[PDB]
Design a protein around this ligand. Structure first.
Ligand SMILES: Cc1cc(C(F)(C(F)(F)F)C(F)(F)F)ccc1NC(=O)c1cccc(I)c1C(=O)NC(C)(C)CS(C)(=O)=O
Ligand SMILES: Cc1cc(C(F)(C(F)(F)F)C(F)(F)F)ccc1NC(=O)c1cccc(I)c1C(=O)NC(C)(C)CS(C)(=O)=O
Ligand SMILES: Nc1ncnc2c1ncn2[C@@H]1O[C@H](COP(=O)(O)OP(=O)(O)OP(=O)(O)O)[C@@H](O)[C@H]1O
Ligand SMILES: Nc1ncnc2c1ncn2[C@@H]1O[C@H](COP(=O)(O)OP(=O)(O)OP(=O)(O)O)[C@@H](O)[C@H]1O
Ligand SMILES: Cn1c(=O)c2c(ncn2C)n(C)c1=O
Ligand SMILES: [Ca+2]
Ligand SMILES: [Zn+2]
Ligand SMILES: [Zn+2]
Lengths: 727, 146, 48, 49
């Protein structure tokens, strides 16, 4: 609201702030000289944290060159000599941790207790040339004396770091906000170099983002990112979902759902991260949980020991021979005279059947939730928004899903556990409350009569919900492939040739191969037709042979024994389709010459036409289709890599508009619109309270809690509105 | 230099310098870099050929050993498909080069015993290998040239 | 080629208006801009 | 890189790269931050002398 931000811009509020600036720079530098003064100083840092966030919330709704920004900067330079004293206090107490991490001063202490001598550590700071002369006696006075041989550099590093943590980040926000807001202020240029160390210690934990709300203006929004949110973001199990999410959105997804899939992806990744935090490192439950944690943690590598074994049980098997007298036919092993192979074969079989099971359990305990999360989310959301069932009517998927609504735990992974009430209330009467409570199993009256508002897993394991979950998982594809790998492994103990069907998983995983495997199924609906066309053409050329050319079809040399393959038309047709399309010269290559004048010319056309139509055209098209489907699937993976280096993926502005300066597009992508920044912003919003969301924060949040996507830039990024007014 | 020097050992080595015409002559040097341009995705295709011919060797070693008698002599039986390490080499040697698939080099399935199954074995070995993969490869090669 | 003539159609019908020769970019400066434009401004069904 | 980490001690590291004073430059610019004497030992400069 401007009407308050105008009145605050015209009082003596700056002159109030200047007095608060002068008391802050002098209270700390007096209070930093005792251990028994530290209780007071933590309160002071939390106070000026709340002061500068008032300055930030005063500087929201800010234009690039506005007088509020200009009254902010001269007030900082009317309060110069103290505001560097607070800046140098942040600057000295941050390099103190980075200096003491060097081994040059751990070598300067020879005490095994760690109690470094004061004058010894005094010349240590005098050895490095970054601090000043008065700084070390300021630091020696900050240190404890303890018979002048003990400063205890370890506790001295982190003592004044954790209470000074958020405020040192927060002051860097305001400095980098205003410097990004107004250009050409050399006092700010004096300020930014004076506070360089607090920038780089608080640049990775910072994140920038740019949203456009509040009557068509984009503005830089800033936030904190924890160490924990960046730790479980740079995991490959999270990253593999992203690389797929990059693919199927820019390839087949339109510009509309791009953002809707993005926040859905932001929902799903946030999920996997919760369940990865769940598994991060009488007692039957405890032992089993340790077992599961061990499994899932190794899960990525337990697949490699399954691949090895399987490539070994083969090199062994590749040594079978057959004979009558078993040293009827008795399959046995060559016995190459190495370590007894049979024994090792049995051992590896066992293993390959165990290390499969423990590949199934891992999948069940890792990738299941994120699927029974994707289903629950999508369902509930297409329920309380589109009113799928109560108003409209369904898709085998939908019919199957119309089974858990009665369940007492419908939202079992979808965080929102109140999606029951919402739908009822929003269609309360329109479709009959009691009817809706019956459909959803809420128990209406008693439900709302729940005392909550007013005032042994096997033991109670709901059956019906388990049935729904198993149905949906068995409907999954990747679980079916792991079920097939288990079933083949198990069946292998029946006959080791089945340990030659795991041998085959090298293929379905090895990238360049997996493409060649999807080629067939990519357009089978238009390759099966071609095969069928081959079947019908060979049919038509079989019928004529069965009406006029039966005479020639005698593939038996024996004078007496006549074969006459072309008598039972079901036999002639198979003869053609078996040795016809494989002759390479057509059918006429496998029958007697037409030298006989009888129908000689007609057969001379039958041969040539069968060859040309089939073995030159169709046995070509097919190959054609195949090779092609292999080429296109090698381009869909190309266009992505192309455009991700050409478009911003948030706004549809190419790289040319950001090529009018070095690293223009690069910098734009790297800080203006890193989508990682957006996904972090979503987590930061979800984490903090509601009573603390600032204006723009609460605004974007409340436009998210009802699924409106008008707060993404999509058309201009802070260099099309203010391009002229900023250099 | 090493080939030239070794040539004095046996003049056929003066047929390895003969080959430098190639590595310098532009239009050729391209054809030579084609193979190494994407070998990481052509070696995989070869390997896929190896594995498919393997899978079609195993079935022949479990049900079709009977047919694999490439020796005409009445007495002397060859039976190439007895030592699986022998049957697999027989396939990978005269299989992918038949141009009509493996079924072009064995006795006819006229015998009703497993006649239909062999009529599918032949056609599938031909289609999957000699029409698809021995095509892709050529494909990869020609492309890398384009 | 006969598999591309059927491609270009599906491409451009999602790129041009078919009544005015204005692409989808000019109607991309707002959500569903091109979509709304096609759906009410120029549904040729409306003309017929 | 590992192989290149062999000539830094050599008395003639910049043998074709015209700049033959690239020894001093690096020392001076990281003079203390990483220990002069340590850097002179790494680069075979013989610091003081
Ligand atoms: C380890 C491995 C390496 C290679 C390499 F080719 C590559 F280059 F790709 F890495 C090689 F390293 F060998 F060179 C190929 C496949 C595997 N196999 C598995 O990961 C594995 C093992 C057992 C059970 C299952 I399930 C799997 C497994 O995850 N399979 C699939 C096919 C990837 C599962 S899916 C159908 O994609 O969901
Ligand atoms: C003279 C010549 C002509 C032709 C013509 F084909 C062309 F049209 F290209 F000019 C021809 F004139 F014959 F038509 C082709 C190759 C040569 N060979 C050499 O230059 C030669 C000789 C000996 C040792 C070496 I080393 C070379 C030589 O430089 N080789 C390479 C292969 C170019 C060296 S590299 C691997 O490229 O570094
Ligand atoms: N808004 C964006 N516009 C264009 N490209 C983007 C955008 N956001 C991220 N990227 C892309 O993300 C990539 C970041 O580099 P990086 O290699 O780390 O990611 P990756 O190639 O997908 O694989 P990974 O990060 O897992 O190693 C860059 O290619 C960068 O272009
Ligand atoms: N003026 C127009 N510009 C671009 N596209 C148009 C225009 N008018 C109609 N269309 C196209 O007509 C299609 C309407 O969707 P719809 O699927 O119903 O038609 P269809 O795909 O041709 O087949 P059918 O309507 O018979 O089911 C949209 O793809 C829409 O882009
Ligand atoms: C896991 N999770 C989310 O993913 C989420 C949320 N609110 C919004 N989202 C996206 N809550 C409360 C939540 O617990
Ligand atoms: Ca508030
Ligand atoms: Zn952008
Ligand atoms: Zn129009």
């Amino acid at each position: 609201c401007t009407g308050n931000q105008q009145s605050l811009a015209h009082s003596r509020l700056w002159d109030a702030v200047v007095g608060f600036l002068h008391v802050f720079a002098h209270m700390m530098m007096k209070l930093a000289q005792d251990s028994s003064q530290i209780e007071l100083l933590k309160e002071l840092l939390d106070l000026q944290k709340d002061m500068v966030v008032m300055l930030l919330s005063l500087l929201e709704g800010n234009v690039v060159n506005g007088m509020i920004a200009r009254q902010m900067v001269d007030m900082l330079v009317e309060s110069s000599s103290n505001v560097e004293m607070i800046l140098k206090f942040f600057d000295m107490f941050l390099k103190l941790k980075d200096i003491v991490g060097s081994e040059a001063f751990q070598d300067y202490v020879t005490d095994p207790r760690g109690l470094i001598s004061k004058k010894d550590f005094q010349k240590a700071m005098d050895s490095q040339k970054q601090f000043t002369g008065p700084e070390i006696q300021f630091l020696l006075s900050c240190s404890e004396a303890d018979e002048n041989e003990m400063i205890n550099f370890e506790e001295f590093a982190n003592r004044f770091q954790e209470p000074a943590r958020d405020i040192g980040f927060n002051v860097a926000v305001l400095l980098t906000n205003l410097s990004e807001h107004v250009p050409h202020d050399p006092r700010l240029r004096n300020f930014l170099e004076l506070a360089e160390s607090i920038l780089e210690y608080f640049r990775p934990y910072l994140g920038r983002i740019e949203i456009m709300g509040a009557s068509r203006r984009i503005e830089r929004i800033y936030f904190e990112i924890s160490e924990t949110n960046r730790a479980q973001w740079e995991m490959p199990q999270v990253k593999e979902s992203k690389r797929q999410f990059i693919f199927d959105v820019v390839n087949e997804g339109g510009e509309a759902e791009k953002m809707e899939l993005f926040v859905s992806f932001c929902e799903d990744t946030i999920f996997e991260m919760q369940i990865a935090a769940q598994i991060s490192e009488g007692e039957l439950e405890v032992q089993r949980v340790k077992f599961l944690n061990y499994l899932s943690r190794n899960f990525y590598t337990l697949k490699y020991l399954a691949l090895f074994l399987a490539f070994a049980i083969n090199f062994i098997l590749l040594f079978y021979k057959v004979s009558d007298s078993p040293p009827n036919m008795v399959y046995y092993f060559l016995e190459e005279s190495t370590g007894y192979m049979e024994p090792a074969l049995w051992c590896l079989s066992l293993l390959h059947t165990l290390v499969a099971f423990l590949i199934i359990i891992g999948y069940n305990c890792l990738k299941v939730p994120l699927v029974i999360f994707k289903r629950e989310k999508e369902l509930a959301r297409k329920l309380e928004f589109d009113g799928l069932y109560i108003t409209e009517q369904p898709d085998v998927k939908g019919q199957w899903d119309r089974l858990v609504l009665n369940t007492p735990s419908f939202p079992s992974n979808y965080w929102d556990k109140f999606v029951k009430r919402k739908v009822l209330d929003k269609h309360g009467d329109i479709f009959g409350r009691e009817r809706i409570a019956e459909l959803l199993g809420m128990d209406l009256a008693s439900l709302e009569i729940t005392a909550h508002n007013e005032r042994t897993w096997l033991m109670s394991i709901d059956v019906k919900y388990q049935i729904w979950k198993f149905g949906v998982i068995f409907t999954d594809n990747s679980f079916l492939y792991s079920g097939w790998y288990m079933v083949m492994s198990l069946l292998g103990h029946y006959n080791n040739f089945f340990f030659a069907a795991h041998l085959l998983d090298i293929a379905m995983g090895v990238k360049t191969l997996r493409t060649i495997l999807s080629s067939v199924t990519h357009n089978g609906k238009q390759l099966v037709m071609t095969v069928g066309l081959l079947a019908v053409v060979v049919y038509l050329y079989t019928v004529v042979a069965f009406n006029f050319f039966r005479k020639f079809y005698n593939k038996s040399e024996d004078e007496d024994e006549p074969d006459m393959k072309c008598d039972d038309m079901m036999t002639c047709y198979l003869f053609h389709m078996y040795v016809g399309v494989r002759a390479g010269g057509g059918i006429g290559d496998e029958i007697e010459d037409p030298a006989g004048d009888e129908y000689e010319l007609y057969r001379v056309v039958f041969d040539i036409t069968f060859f040309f139509f089939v073995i030159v055209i169709l046995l070509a098209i097919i190959q054609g289709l195949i090779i092609d489907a292999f080429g296109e699937l090698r381009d869909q993976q190309e266009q992505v890599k192309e455009d991700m280096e050409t478009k911003c993926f948030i706004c549809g502005i190419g790289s040319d508009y950001f090529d009018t300066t070095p690293h223009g597009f690069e910098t734009h992508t790297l800080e203006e619109h890193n989508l990682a920044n957006y996904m972090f912003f979503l987590m930061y919003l979800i984490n903090k309270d509601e009573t603390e969301h600032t204006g723009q924060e609460s605004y974007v949040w409340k436009m998210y809690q009802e699924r409106c996507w008008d707060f993404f830039p999509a058309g201009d990024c802070f260099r099309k509105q203010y391009e002229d007014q900023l250099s």
